[PDB]
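As the next step, I needed to go through one protein, both as residues and as discrete backbone shape codes, included below for the reader:
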Amino acid sequence: TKLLVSLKVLVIQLNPQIGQVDQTIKRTWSILDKVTKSATYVKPDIILFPEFALTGYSFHARKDILPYVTKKDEGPSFELAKSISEKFQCYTIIGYPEEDDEQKLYNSALVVNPQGGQIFNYRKTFLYDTEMNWDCEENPEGFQTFPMDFSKCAKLSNEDSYNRDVTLKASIGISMDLSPYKFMAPFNHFEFSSFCVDNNVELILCPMAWLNSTSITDKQTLHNNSLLEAAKNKIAFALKEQGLPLAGSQGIYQLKIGDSQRTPRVPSDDSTSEYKDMDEPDMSNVNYWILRFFPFLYFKLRINWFKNSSLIESILGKTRMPLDHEYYKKEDLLDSEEVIKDTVLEKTFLGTSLGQPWKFQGKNAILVLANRCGTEDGTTIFAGSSGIYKFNGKKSSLDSLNESVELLGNLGKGLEGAILREVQFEVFR
């Protein structure tokens, strides 16, 4: 049975700096105040914050992050999410540095329900270089899904109001989760978005601290002090030229609350990566994020792949996680008398399944991406450009020109702020 859903989604975009937790919390409440006073404010059903939203991102040592870590149900990030959830009767998701009872450290995202109860805690699964600085662990469960019970958000197709409840299958992916494993795995594995398609995920939530490519990431540059000093001067100039302090903008809020302004479809070029125009999204990254969700995108060639059975071996052969992942530290169908289970028929590679050219065809999914803005260490510029997307499953560019994705709205690359969109889509029950 087709069920129509309407979700009011609020994304908060922050520029947290290390050691400013109290200031960032104060700015967060300021943003939320301004949001409620907006001409077209409506109450959000879900509020999403970035990766390490209150603490800053670039920790260089375990000792440096220890003063900011918390248990998943204690401390500033949890208490903020609980108060938010209670005041707005919503789900609130926030990224934060976690410590467990055994003194292990993770990069996590906690989920609070409208009652102010913690219902889920997700840990980053693919780690970035920075996490290795401070002894961060990989999520031993790998990618995960969880239910979210939404009240009064759904209707049958012939009904005139959203008066029904719906439990959506959700998944959180934290920044690097979207990349090829360690940047070393084949690009076309699309591990995270494949997992979401495999498990029929409906609501994809991504707290991120994702870089604009103006950032200094070249390893030989980072470890040659002469080259590094020259590189840092380049970034300093880029910020100065924009009338910005080196850490980037804070406290000046771009609000897009309840409007329906969509983001224009644009291809990447040698200018779309430039850190200029702070109220406009980084379309190099928007296009790249969309590409990393390839399994959700319409692509003509899949009919040939299916007809030729070109991906059967890849589909049968793919494992739940990379074999060297923390996941297996958990345990050929064609050469066996074991039967083919349902789960195998749900598996995809490049968006293709054993039974359909395009498994996602005819389905809907919502992607909510909360990316931080600002800069750290004089080297690292975050891309901002938080946004909300709909994959509509409708029947082949690999970017925002592909009309099987809908760009429902983005914030700029450089300003703190918030975006609210009412998102309408369907699920099947």
User: Anything to note?
Assistant: Residues 1-429 form one domain. The CA atoms of residues 140 and 329 lie 8 Å apart. The radius of gyration is 21 Å.
